[model samples]
Target: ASAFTEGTDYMVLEKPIPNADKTLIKVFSYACPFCYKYDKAVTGPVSDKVADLVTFTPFHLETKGEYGKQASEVFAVLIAKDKAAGISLFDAKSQFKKAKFAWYAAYHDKKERWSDGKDPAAFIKTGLDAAGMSQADFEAALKDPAVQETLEKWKAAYDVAKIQGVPAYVVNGKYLIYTKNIKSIDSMAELVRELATKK
Candidate 1:
């Protein structure tokens, strides 16, 4: 809060909401290295500190191309499936991150592709397996129209936000915290707390 500045550290959306109590959104991509670093350094610590105060939502970025799009689709579909299964979003993070981190390992570190063929489901089999999900459920989840609908909703949000790259943070859909300027978990916590507490 003390070192941050408008246009330099963050930006107020042109279509800023008049008021939102507290919502934290992270726009990220599994293929993005900075996002990987975020999950490594910023995610756990920050979440623990602000768990009771803020609503944290992470949206997968797909501007990278087919691979990014595939990851986004799977990510959204898993969330939808979790909802149908009556799992809390918070409880779903393990499975979500399990799949997500696997994608990160393959795409970013191992330099691998999601799938050799057109189907993305095949690529994420390990992730589903890690989450203890059945192949049938995975296929069924992808077939559901709700998956596509959820994908489009996040896509539209990305477009509207004019996000140029990954590892971006949007607080309450109004304040776009410049993640590029953040160097440590402390800075991340400071930024979130500052915005979440703002009147």
Candidate 2:
């Protein structure tokens, strides 16, 4: 039930995720391969180019699958503790890679990658280890109620946004789906910049 209002929709949420008085750059995801690929290729240079003009923020979207909720829960716990460190910790790189690898393994082994309840805990453990994060720290974070609450809020936001799939962009609140047409990072960045500059 969300509609896009043009004119450089430059409203930022006040509480935690800093959005400044610039267009909202919302990145939706719950371990989408296309989202992961697009995020890596597009976000950096575009962010650098518009560092002063706009605020780049990635929203860990929630959906039907338990993995989305699980990932969001993990992120919410991290975010509630410390904004900066939490933001840094949930950078999506390792998780994306893990997801990507799992997809590759699926293709090679002829198995389902994410579904079938494939023991994400083990994958999580591996990702955490790769990121230099300890299981103890994650366990502590996972148990916190505040994190749980935050994740619930995150899910609400996704519902409000009426998100259908991952790897989409909401520039100035203008929703743009990037699954099919987004060929390269440059195209995504260019579109984002064009939208940002419009207002």
Candidate 3:
């Protein structure tokens, strides 16, 4: 495996990772095409491969526009709702990841006008339903401050990265890996494993 260069490949973080174990935070946004592809081609297979060794957190970047913000909030709500419904935290993240793909299909592939003055809650329902969750549950999740708090926590990490784009990766909250530096799914996985081995 290649040795990833700090500053060139990634930036060091000021804060520590949340989990005590080896952790990987995937910083992505719903409307980002590269993020969509990365989720499918790299994250999906690589995450499964390292499930036993690393704790992966999907951190949704709060985008610049209304649509992007709503998309971010939708994910936050899902995480909270899943936790309240008794699903393991990681499992909820996995479900949210799947819901992201479904949203991508609806907006990008199927050309759904999700941002056309529709209620954000309604847009969130699409993802919830795809995750086999109930609309009622999501409705409740939106009202829960726990969801907003989670989103705020993630935004703090996003601020630390100071990234201007999507599909970024913060490894163990010490290295903010740039998207361009990642060679491929295999290389990305290898790099992550190597990083996980570091103290």
Q: Give the whole-model CA lDDT for all candidates, comma-separated.
A: 0.69, 0.50, 0.70
Model 3 pairs in collision: none
Cα-based TM-score, every candidate: 0.79, 0.58, 0.78
Cα lDDT for residue 126, candidate 1: 52
lDDT tens digits by residue: candidate 2, 19-80: 32355445455445555555456656666666566666556776734455555555454455
lDDT of 1 by residue, 3-58 (tens): 67788778877765333347677778776888888887687687667767777767
Candidate 2 lands at a TM-score of 0.58
**What is the C-alpha RMSD, rounded to one decimal, of candidate 2?**
6.8
Looking at model 3, how many pairs of residues clash?
0
Candidate 3's residue-wise lDDT over 83-129, tens digit each? 56666434534556557878887777777766674677667776777
